[PDB]
Design a protein around this ligand. Structure first.
Ligand code: HEM
Ligand code: HEM
Ligand SMILES: CNCCN(C)c1cccc(CCc2cc(C)cc(N)n2)c1
Ligand SMILES: CNCCN(C)c1cccc(CCc2cc(C)cc(N)n2)c1
Ligand SMILES: C[C@H](O)[C@H](O)[C@H]1CNc2nc(N)[nH]c(=O)c2N1
Ligand SMILES: C[C@H](O)[C@H](O)[C@H]1CNc2nc(N)[nH]c(=O)c2N1
Ligand SMILES: [Zn+2]
Lengths: 411, 407
């Protein structure tokens, strides 16, 4: 079966054959679309086909499909599953797997860079302290004094689901949020629950507007431990505006390194519950969502006040006007300190080319339009006008429940 | 089977039960989501009439009444005899308001119940059609105080006798392909603009020439008519701070009036059902003016603002986009023509969603279309999970007549 997508700006039509290789569900049916819904211990039984599938993919990519090296590996894995109920990936397989999980990530606009991913194998790690070490090294390597490099660190895979490695932080670097008795919030409202946990686990909170959270690390199913990332390894960028001198006085800054640490990495049916990954920011992530979401820092009014916009009627577009200047400020700041960042025009245009190249060479590119289109200026980016097919391929990054909700406390 | 939707900005969760009444298909499967794709007999007829009459009679709190049962047999008799049936005025009106109510892609649906319905099923000719349409335009325009309306022409019979309005909207600017290779006027209408000329229209070959109506009655050949200019309300576009802005020579019409869709009610098909409301500002300023394949004026506005257009990262496109949209709202409000900004309209839609969930068990909605094409996440609909499904009565797409019509 062939499926066609059309770009309604360029009339370019592409044909997808890759969806045929799609396994997992979407959440949609013939009678209902769930494309705007945010969130849509394995047996030896189901494990081997999943291993076989992966290994088949792997050996095809290296052009050794049906070789003795291929067959022997299948046999080898088959036996290891029957006698041990699981198996270990070769380094080459782990690297291929991690890159392809990124490549298959349909909500990610930045996938043109997928083949350039630095894979840190942390499968020999045994303790929280060991995790801290790996993570520090990840952060130093990725930051690279401002010239950012994509990386992922992979901790040991799930066994019986009782010895999980987990990073409790949603991101490696993130600002604390504090609920005040008056109901207002100090810092990042999105991190209030996590900050409270850290505090309870013994973290002495400085209680400012931008306190870098501590790492809360769980190894081998044990209770999580607190570590503070060395400040010298956390690159931050004070935000200022190229024309507005008062902007610096808002007191804003942000960190340079976006690093997601709460996702699950599935490769060949194996589950890696601790796999922090990092790249670089698209400007709007900070300047639109982080600064301007009503439930985040929420700086639109204060910025608009200073620009002296007509804030009486929404139809003055004072919110839209302030949003653009804030986003201009974020980009100007990062560029000025030579910390890697990409604007949403540049990023979306690159994704279009990547997507086109993925149709030619791969037969498709699964993409989630709802997430790909930037949260400001949507239709002046080429992705707005691009029809996309969303379906799920493995290897993949998956969601997983927050550890504080599932963890068995030891004491 | 009882689905929930969350607003991630307010934590409000709503439970959807209405989707269970859905009958038509979405185009998605368990394996692939097509949510971003633009375009996915007597025995057929009677269940459709039934489903429709059941909901109609339920809406008037007379489910399982003699009148209900009586009407059901009456329509059954008529289908079994005529191979079709006629809607009572009351059903027709209910039908139309519900097609709008059910339009999952429409952000302006909070007003759905105040639709003025013009019954034009007695129409037999294109001059006839023209007369109905002029009346519609005048009534809906209301000297700038816009009122929603629909005019309904006779239902399809054998597909040989279709009424069609060939225009996509009642009022649209013409578009011409100059020998330069460039495009003068609206590029979206180049092909239809040729068909007008091919059928006899004399273009003023300008930039904002109001297209002529091309009307088809009983499957006959379509005819041209020029709407009385005095009935087409337009808004010169100026900026409340940029005095130079008016020299760009931009204007826009006040009445958005979609004329090419198909209205399906109780199995019956109305291929000519022009309807109209009032603009949300971004349709004009973001899409019409700044789409690359439309008037595409970003670069020239940017020049006039003397913005640093060297790098994409100065966000000069974004900056101009805001100003252009500021101007659109300003000009319409200044001339007292109804318009709504994307903040007000999306906040209204959220309130409507809440009303629909609490009073109907849900509200079908297409996030891809509801989220305005600028400043998406600073409007509340961005953070609102929505379920998309197909309810009837409905507005559907239908093929362009020129590809179909047998002369
Ligand atoms: C290098 C530059 C990168 C850019 C500019 C980028 C951009 C983005 C953006 C803007 C999102 C939307 C998330 C949000 O708005 O909350 C996203 C999602 C995502 N990204 Fe990327 N990313 C980059 C690197 C990476 C890397 C290195 C990985 C994995 C190895 C990755 C995997 C993902 C995944 C799995 C999602 C899905 C999130 C979800 O499902 O909720 N990205 N990306
Ligand atoms: C009164 C103020 C109204 C507003 C502000 C409004 C707004 C909108 C907008 C912005 C869209 C997106 C379409 C696009 O971007 O091209 C839309 C779609 C739509 N509207 Fe409304 N509308 C209004 C009245 C009406 C009325 C009176 C009807 C029918 C009687 C209607 C039926 C529809 C339908 C069927 C669609 C989707 C068409 C499709 O499937 O592509 N609207 N509306
Ligand atoms: C509900 N929010 C999603 C949080 N998650 C799971 C998530 C996943 C991937 C990406 C993001 C946005 C942060 C980010 C991460 C990376 C590696 C790059 C980038 N530009 N942004 C967030
Ligand atoms: C891209 N979609 C095709 C154009 N169609 C079929 C379509 C249908 C309904 C609405 C629109 C947008 C124009 C419009 C119409 C009405 C009544 C109100 C309004 N504010 N805008 C367009
Ligand atoms: C590819 C994508 O489906 C297409 O660009 C859609 C996106 N959302 C839209 N939303 C609205 N309101 N109007 C449109 O024309 C479109 N176009
Ligand atoms: C309800 C809706 O799906 C939700 O708000 C989505 C919309 N699109 C998004 N797009 C990005 N990049 N990030 C997001 O968190 C979201 N959130
Ligand atoms: Zn879908």
């Amino acid at each position: 079966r062939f499926l066609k997508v059309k770009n309604w700006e360029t009339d370019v039509v592409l044909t997808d054959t890759l969806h045929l290789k799609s396994t997992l569900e979407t959440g949609c049916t013939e009678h209902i679309c769930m494309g705007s819904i945010m969130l849509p211990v394995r047996t030896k039984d189901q494990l081997f086909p999943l291993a076989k599938e992966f290994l088949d993919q792997y050996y095809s990519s290296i052009k050794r499909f049906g070789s003795k090296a291929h067959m022997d590996r299948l046999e080898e894995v088959n036996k290891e599953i029957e006698s041990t109920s699981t198996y270990q990936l070769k380094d080459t397989e782990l690297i291929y797997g991690a890159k392809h999980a990124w490549r298959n990530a349909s909500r990610c606009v930045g996938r043109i860079q997928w083949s350039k991913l630095q894979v840190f194998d942390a499968r020999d790690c045994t303790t929280a302290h060991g995790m801290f070490n790996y993570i520090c090294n990840h952060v130093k390597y990725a930051t690279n004094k401002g010239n950012l490099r994509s990386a992922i660190t992979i901790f040991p895979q799930r066994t019986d689901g009782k010895h999980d490695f987990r990073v409790w932080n949603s991101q490696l670097i993130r600002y604390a949020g504090y609920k005040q008795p008056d109901g207002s919030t100090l810092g990042d409202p999105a991190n209030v629950q996590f900050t409270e946990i850290c505090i309870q686990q013994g973290w002495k909170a400085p209680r400012g507007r931008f306190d870098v959270l501590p790492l809360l690390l769980q190894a081998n199913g044990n209770d999580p431990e607190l570590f503070q990332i060395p400040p010298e390894l956390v690159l931050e960028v004070p935000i200022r505006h190229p024309k507005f001198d008062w902007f610096k006085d808002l007191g804003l800054k942000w960190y340079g390194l976006p690093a997601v640490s709460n996702m699950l990495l599935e490769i060949g049916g194996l589950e890696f519950s601790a796999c922090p990954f990092s790249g670089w920011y698209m400007g709007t992530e900070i300047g639109v969502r982080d600064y301007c979401d009503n439930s985040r820092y929420n700086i639109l009014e204060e910025v608009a006040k200073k620009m002296d916009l007509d804030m009486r009627k929404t139809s003055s577009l004072w919110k839209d006007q302030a949003l653009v200047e804030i986003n201009i400020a974020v980009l100007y700041s990062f560029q000025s300190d030579k910390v890697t960042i990409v604007d949403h025009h540049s990023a979306t245009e690159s994704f279009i080319k990547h997507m086109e190249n993925e149709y030619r060479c791969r037969g498709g590119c699964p993409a989630d339009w709802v997430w790909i289109v930037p949260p400001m200026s949507g239709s002046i980016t080429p992705v707005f006008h691009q029809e996309m097919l969303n379906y799920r391929l493995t290897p993949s990054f998956e969601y997983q429940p927050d550890p504080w909700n599932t963890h068995v406390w030891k004491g």
